Design a protein around this ligand. Structure first.
Ligand SMILES: Nc1ncnc2c1ncn2[C@@H]1O[C@H](COP(=O)(O)OP(=O)(O)OP(=O)(O)O)[C@@H](O)[C@H]1O
Ligand SMILES: Nc1ncnc2c1ncn2[C@@H]1O[C@H](COP(=O)(O)OP(=O)(O)O)[C@@H](O)[C@H]1O
Ligand SMILES: [Mg+2]
Ligand SMILES: [Mg+2]
Lengths: 35, 466, 53, 477, 456
């Protein structure tokens, strides 16, 4: 049950996906501007 | 045509005719019985043998006993003489008030109205119940279905609808008790007498009563809904009247079929149900309809086995209703009564062109905020209330206020709560929910909306609490 | 402020674990019911298919 | 003679295929050569299916089956009071034969709509929680539903024992004759129960119908209907009977066995389709008759055992849809020491509230309101609600095999709801209660007598109660 | 009467009798076989044919093979000469020590005692084990569900119960290995021989073994429990003893019944179990009771399928259990023996009306102090340390050395009376031993031994 929280969908898996995307769109912005 | 019994298995009787095999659906009278034992023909088995379903208990039946063919299906008296009377599945009076002296009898088996006899008008039927009026309004001449498990409030709701709609009704009304408590029938009879709706002294009664209850064998429980249908059909077709038809419980009809489907020698379907479940239900339900010769508004209570809403019987009944009120045990255990599930009850007049754009928008906003709260439930349940945004906290507060405001004290429920029953008009309901949605009561405690009528009583209760 | 957030966080995570364990117990009851019902339904399907021969 | 006699064609699966009996009726009692009996279930063109009320071990193919000419019936009458009989009305206590001159069919139908009238008289259980919050009236069907070992049989036995105060009096319209039907219980448990009732002198008005775990499934299927006929004998003769079915889950299991052995289509949880009718036709016979039919009643207390507290299962919801309310016994409350473990928020009595005595109403309206507020709360007003709720909860606990008269319950609930216990620490409430009761029993018999005679707390009696409670609480710890 | 085999389908055999059909549950001997093949009649099919379940393998059976009706159910030899032996479901010796020479045989199918033969009062069966006698006592004539499997000393507990009942109450024991693995059956036989419970030289054996292995057809594994129960019933009714009956496993009894019912062509009930599940369990368990002559107390190893207590087999077994003894590995890791979990073991007679107000109060105090200790362990004040100390002492004192282990540990075996147990735990609770060290209560008998050990 390693990805059990995001494989089940639901609020705790949809918030995890949103948090991941937020962090990495931030990092992709601060990685592209530094290119 | 005289036949003889060759087999008896529970409620199913195989009868053997030498001359004159009777058609299917005929009524046969067993000879040598104290009370009238009627068998309805269901199958021709070949070899001049028919299979039949008994309308009463089959104890004491012997192989070789004689049976007479009536020549027609079960015929019940229909007419204004059935008003204020109680009849059983085969039309006998069971109120000890003597015979029912009608001028005409109708077979309880008839074809549904044609496609060209249908009516399309969709006036709204205001009941005085906030959740029903707002989210899933009933329609005049429509089909209402109250779903719910055991002990969630189907009978309280149907008696509140009898109290609100049937009392001030213009036309007639028929109540068919199908597989329910006999003491509930006694309660309803004596309550309709003490309220003057049934008049034992003249011809002013306005309600007919048919009853085959949970003590009756499966054949009577299978045909008593048809008997009630027949009375209502007479009052619709042959008098042009606007009829109310209350059925409780319609599920029992289906259930009774199951009990005989095994004995009729049919391969079972899913959940052990008769393979003919949907066709039997449709054959019954298409007679419960409005035509252009008269209107029938039908309130049917539908039992949900083991609270399983996907059970074949309720899942098949869903497609026959114009408006559905789905009661919930989870909502009832929170203390919200009626336990109507706001995110599961629907109606076909919930269309802005029918209810007005204001009503439509208020109902849609209520459902949207309740759905948002339902989405937040998980994060609320594990991480608690503190981890929500301020907008999430605001929508949770408003959604809980709306939840409590959907509850309402019933006039028929005073006797076990003491609180007087409130009857909320439609405009008051729209206004109160509009104001809770706009944010005009974000300061009142959420327990001030619980078990009140209009929003003014909520403000008064909030004051009294402080 | 520390010793106030390190104890409030401890209490919050304790309550979160308590609620999670309660939900786990409820869901385990539901799971057992559902799997028993599934076994019985499959058995009834097989028996009904075999009795039709 | 293939008209009053048959020969067993086959036996197995509890069902005997018999050849002959061309004159047998449906549901008629036949008798095998080995002394056993059976019910003619399926009449078929070439054979009769007979449900055997015993072990198949006793019947061989070729055995001769005579017919009794009587639809299945049991002996009824007052000669059964104090006897322990099996599902067929045969004595199993070794005190000789039942001297009954009346028999009654076990499969009779319930009274219709007209013979009945609404339940009005109280059925005193002697349990504070029941009599105050879940009142039961004579003619009601109240479900005792709960997990294993939560106290259901104890509630039933306390009711049976409590009826002793009325059955010794001179008022005939207040006596209650008890019937206990044991279905699939251990036989040692039923023997211990019979002794417990004999010690309390409660057997002289009790009939015990026993179909235990080692009895054939048809006997456990039939026992409820035998008991119900024994109670209908009183219901139809102007008297009042109470009947406990302990329990109907095991009768449903026995009926499911009989159905699956007959190769009938299984439904939910492999139960037959007519497992609802099984209990509905039985519990509909518990009724209150109007004065044109005698005025007698039959009160039913069907017991149901849930699994892991799931009351949304098949048989629990069936019996909930049949009866007039239920008494939820919770395991969490039983393990925490709250006994009887009644879930007062989920236990309901639909038709019994109109049967409560006036004094019990006077105190129990306030008690119900306050316990409700306590349930919703869990400042200085909410802590007062917590204190009052904890005190009332401790006041609702009760021992075993000691039911209370209604006036004593009224006095205790009075001392509780009027607020006199708000300074006592909760761990002492119980103690106080006993002490208080003892006092009111010895020094103040006249106030109890006048509350019993009036049926209400007069203002004179209310002042006497206030005086006594204040004077006792003064000289208490 | 002699019939002939007309059908052989797996472990089901249809036998046709030209005359005198045998009643249901009779035993039929198939003729012309190298080893004894017994068939138990289950149905009368009509046309003089009976259907039977086989008690052994049916390979090499021929249609028309002669079969002899025995005129009774399966009869086994009962008596003292069964003590120390191993027999199978049909009463044959399987330990290679010759014939079991008893004077009387008994059918394995008998009826439960009549209602007028039941003991109307519950009473305690004193086992001499402190944790059992105190916290979850055994009712004389009741059923005890023994939870916990391997690595918690279940066999040592079984042998200690046998020995303690033989010494204190003077009653023998039966061990029914239903569905027994042959490896573990051999292991248990030799563990009992070593610990002295079975004696291959003199007549002082205390237990009679009845094995039905896993490689036997479902009928044998279904009736082996009744065979052991018949031996125990002899020891109760004819000798007037307080017999112990061990049933391992009871879930295998249920499974064998399920397989037998599925082979006979019966429609399965819920979760696949036999439609006669409750009545099978009932006709077995109702014979384990207290009569006016003696009693039979049954310890039954419980297995819960999928760890779901609402499964039909555990939920049907639990309706009969009068006590529960949970052997936990966490307690065994703490060196405490027996590994009886003191908070999870329950008893229905732990009730002040049955065990007395004093016994009940002492047991409730012990339980509360153990709960308090674990609640304090959760976080790790003034008296919290006092409860910690007293609960450590209570934990250590629940342990006890068993006689059947003397050849391993060297220590002596303690059979603590019930009064001594109540008194010791009473004194520990009332603070009479807050000066002794906590290691002075480990592996002792009465509390006098605890003070004598603290003297060191
Ligand atoms: N009010 C009470 N006070 C103290 N103990 C009680 C009380 N009620 C029950 N008990 C105890 O709980 C034990 C078991 O409860 P009981 O057998 O009466 O209920 P049950 O649900 O019928 O159990 P079963 O599962 O055997 O059917 C009783 O032996 C009794 O000791
Ligand atoms: N509107 C209500 N107000 C208060 N209590 C209610 C209400 N509806 C149901 N209940 C409670 O739920 C119980 C079940 O009522 P009922 O309608 O007879 O159940 P069913 O769904 O089987 O018809 C009632 O006795 C009552 O205690
Ligand atoms: Mg209803
Ligand atoms: Mg019980």
């Amino acid at each position: 049950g390693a990805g059990s929280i995001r494989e089940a969908g639901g609020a705790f898996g949809k918030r995890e996906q949103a948090e991941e995307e937020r962090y990495f769109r931030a990092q992709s912005r601060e990685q592209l501007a530094a290119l | 045509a005289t036949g003889r019994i060759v087999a008896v298995i529970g409620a199913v009787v195989d009868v053997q005719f030498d001359e004159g095999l009777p058609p299917i659906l005929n009524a046969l009278e067993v000879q040598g019985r104290e009370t009238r034992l009627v068998l309805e023909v269901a199958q021709h088995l070949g070899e001049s043998t028919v299979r039949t379903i008994a309308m009463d208990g089959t104890e004491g039946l012997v192989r070789g006993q004689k049976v007479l063919d009536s020549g027609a299906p079960i015929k019940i008296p229909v007419g204004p003489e059935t008003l204020g009377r109680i009849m059983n599945v085969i039309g006998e009076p069971i109120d000890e008030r003597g015979p029912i002296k009608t001028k005409q009898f109708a077979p309880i088996h008839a074809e549904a109205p044609e496609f060209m006899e249908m009516s399309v008008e969709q006036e709204i039927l205001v009941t005085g119940i906030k959740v029903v009026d707002l989210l899933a309004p009933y329609a005049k001449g429509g089909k209402i279905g109250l779903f719910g498990g055991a002990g969630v409030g189907k009978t309280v709701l149907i008696m509140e609808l009898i109290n609100n709609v049937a009392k001030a009704h213009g036309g007639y009304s028929v109540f068919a008790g199908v597989g329910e408590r006999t003491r509930e029938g006694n309660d309803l009879y004596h309550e309709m007498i003490e309220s003057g709706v049934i008049n034992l002294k003249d011809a002013t009664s306005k309600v007919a009563l048919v009853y085959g209850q949970m003590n009756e064998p499966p054949g009577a429980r299978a045909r008593v809904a048809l008997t009630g249908l027949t009375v209502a059909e007479y009052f619709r077709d042959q008098e042009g009247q606007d009829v109310l038809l209350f059925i409780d419980n319609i599920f029992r009809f289906t259930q009774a079929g199951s009990e005989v489907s095994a004995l009729l020698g049919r391969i079972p379907s899913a959940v052990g149900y008769q393979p003919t479940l949907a066709t039997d239900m449709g054959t019954m339900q298409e007679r419960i309809t409005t035509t252009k010769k008269g209107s029938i508004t039908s309130v049917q209570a539908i039992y949900v086995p083991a609270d399983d809403l996907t059970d074949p019987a309720p899942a098949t009944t869903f497609a026959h209703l114009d408006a559905t009120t789905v009661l919930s045990r989870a909502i009832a255990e929170l203390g919200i009564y009626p336990a109507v599930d706001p995110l599961d009850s629907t109606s076909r007049i919930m269309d802005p062109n029918i209810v007005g754009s204001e009503h439509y928008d208020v109902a849609r906003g209520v459902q949207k905020i309740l759905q948002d709260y339902k989405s937040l439930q998980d994060i609320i349940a594990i991480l608690g209330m503190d981890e929500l945004s301020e907008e999430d906290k605001l929508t949770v507060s408003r959604a809980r206020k709306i939840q409590r405001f959907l509850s309402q004290p019933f006039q028929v429920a005073e006797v076990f709560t003491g609180h007087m029953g409130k009857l909320v008009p439609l405009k008051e309901t729209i206004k109160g929910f509009q104001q809770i949605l706009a944010g005009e009561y974000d300061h009142l405690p959420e327990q001030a909306f619980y078990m009140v009528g209009p929003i003014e009583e909520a403000v008064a209760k909030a004051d009294k609490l402080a | 402020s520390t010793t106030s957030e390190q104890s409030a966080r401890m209490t919050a995570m304790d309550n979160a674990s308590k609620n999670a364990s309660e939900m786990i117990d409820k869901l385990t009851l539901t799971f057992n019911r559902t799997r028993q019902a599934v076994i019985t339904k499959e058995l009834i399907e097989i028996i009904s298919g075999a009795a039709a021969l | 003679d293939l008209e009053e006699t048959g020969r067993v064609l086959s036996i197995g699966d509890g069902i005997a295929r018999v050849h002959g009996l061309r004159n047998v009726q449906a549901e008629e009692m036949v008798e095998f050569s080995s002394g056993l009996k059976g019910m003619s279930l399926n009449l078929e063109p070439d054979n009769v299916g007979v449900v055997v009320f015993g072990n198949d071990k006793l019947i061989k193919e070729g055995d001769i089956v005579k017919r009794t000419g009587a639809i299945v019936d049991v002996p009824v009458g007052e000669e059964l009071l104090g006897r322990v009989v099996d599902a067929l009305g045969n004595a199993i206590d070794g005190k000789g034969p039942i001297g009954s001159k009346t028999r009654r069919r076990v499969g009779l139908k319930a009274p219709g709509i007209i013979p009945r009238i609404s339940v009005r008289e109280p059925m005193q259980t002697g349990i504070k929680a029941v009599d105050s919050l879940v009142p039961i009236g004579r003619g009601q069907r109240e479900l005792i539903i709960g997990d294993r070992q939560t106290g259901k049989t104890s509630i039933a036995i306390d009711t049976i024992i409590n009826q002793k105060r009325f059955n010794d009096g001179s008022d005939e319209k207040k006596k209650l004759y008890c019937i206990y039907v044991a279905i699939g219980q251990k036989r040692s448990t039923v023997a211990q129960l019979v002794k417990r009732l004999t010690d309390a002198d409660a057997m002289k008005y009790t009939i015990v119908v026993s179909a235990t775990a080692s009895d054939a499934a048809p006997l456990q299927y039939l026992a409820p209907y035998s008991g119900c006929s024994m109670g209908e004998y009183f219901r139809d003769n102007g008297k009042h009977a109470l009947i406990i079915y302990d329990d109907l889950s095991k009768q449903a299991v026995a009926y499911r066995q009989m159905s699956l052995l007959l190769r009938r289509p299984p439904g939910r949880e492999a139960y037959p389709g007519d497992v609802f009718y099984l209990h509905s036709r039985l519990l509909e016979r518990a009724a209150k008759m109007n004065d044109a039919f005698g005025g007698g009643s039959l009160t039913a207390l069907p017991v149901i055992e849930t699994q892991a507290g799931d009351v949304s299962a098949y048989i629990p919801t069936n019996v909930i849809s049949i009866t007039d309310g239920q008494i939820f016994l919770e395991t969490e409350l039983f393990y925490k020491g709250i006994r009887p473990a009644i879930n007062v928020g989920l236990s309901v009595s639909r038709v019994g509230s109109a049967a409560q005595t006036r004094a019990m109403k006077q105190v129990a309206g306030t008690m119900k309101l306050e316990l409700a507020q306590y349930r919703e709360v869990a400042d200085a007003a909410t802590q007062q609600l917590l204190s009052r709720g904890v005190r009332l909860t401790e006041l609702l606990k009760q021992g075993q095999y000691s039911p209370m008269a209604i006036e004593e319950q009224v006095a205790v609930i009075y001392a509780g709801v009027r607020g006199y216990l708000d300074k006592l620490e909760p761990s002492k409430i119980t103690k106080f209660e006993n002490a208080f009761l003892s006092h009111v029993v010895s020094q103040h018999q006249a106030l109890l007598g006048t509350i019993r005679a009036d049926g209400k707390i007069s203002e004179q009696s209310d002042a006497k109660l206030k005086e006594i409670v204040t004077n006792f609480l003064a000289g208490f710890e």
